[PDB]
């Protein structure tokens, strides 16, 4: 994150860190949606153009963290993955359409003050909250500029109207995507950045005081570039694939 701040403790209990075992290294962000399911971007696992293709044993899941680098001795839980599921139609060949994947944990994780799931939106929560001008929140351990934080960072951004989204780039934009960030005029800034990928973009409902995961940090052209916007996976739209795989 660029132009963010340090999160408070337990501010974002669904926040997960995708961690490489060897070399040990931060892979991506991700989110806890139940006691055995983790949601992330498909690009965190598979991107053939750069020879990326992680399998279950290449990875670890770290839940409950605050520090980027330290082993939070009785705070975090490390988990092994049972299986990885990628959208069957995620488009790595052109625009990262359907950038999404589920990770099933070997064993259920225990909730606590530092570990709690986020909700998945319903048609109506999507309807009333996904609107130009509303602000959502993004969190992650990525780069602080287009560099490495000591503690999880957080920024709040407004959603941007489709047209602008579109008029900002040459990539083909699908209904499975949305964009957020201020405008050059707005005189306010921030964005996701490298290493933030796969984290949650969240909203808090004003009707029930519950947090909802509206997007996954997908892609973007740089980090905080004037007249550019971060792009996110439309979680609501891919809800049916999610349900489908957990049911199944």
């Amino acid at each position: 994150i660029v132009e963010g701040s340090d999160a408070e403790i337990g501010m974002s209990p669904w926040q997960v860190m995708l961690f490489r075992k060897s070399p040990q290294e931060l892979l991506c962000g991700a989110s806890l949606i139940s006691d055995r399911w983790v949601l992330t971007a498909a690009h965190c696992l598979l991107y053939p153009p750069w020879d990326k293709n992680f399998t279950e044993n290449d990875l670890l899941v770290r839940i409950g963290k605050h520090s980027r680098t330290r082993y939070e001795r009785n705070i975090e839980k490390i988990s092994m993955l049972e299986k990885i599921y990628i959208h069957p139609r995620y488009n790595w060949r052109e625009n990262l359409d359907r950038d999404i994947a589920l990770m099933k944990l070997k064993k259920p994780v225990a909730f606590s003050d530092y570990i709690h799931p986020v909700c998945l939106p319903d048609r109506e929560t999507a309807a009333s909250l996904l609107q130009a001008g509303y602000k959502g929140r993004v969190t992650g351990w990525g780069n602080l500029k287009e560099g490495q934080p000591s503690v999880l960072q957080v920024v709040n951004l407004p959603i941007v109207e489709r047209p602008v989204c579109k008029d900002s780039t040459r990539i083909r934009i699908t209904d499975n995507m949305f964009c957020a960030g201020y405008k050059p005029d707005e005189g306010k800034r921030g964005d996701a950045c490298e290493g933030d990928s796969g984290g949650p973009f969240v909203m808090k409902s004003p009707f029930n005081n519950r947090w909802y995961q509206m997007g996954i940090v997908s892609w973007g052209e740089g980090c905080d570039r004037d007249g550019k916007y971060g792009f996110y996976t439309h979680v609501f739209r891919l809800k049916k694939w999610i349900q489908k795989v957990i049911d199944q």
Binding site: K21, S22, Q24, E25, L26, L60, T69, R70, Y71, I78, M80, Q148
Partner: peptide, 10 residues
């Protein structure tokens, strides 16, 4: 960078 994690994990 990263501090060591219990091999219990790896």
């Amino acid at each position: 960078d990263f501090e060591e994690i219990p091999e219990e994990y790896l």
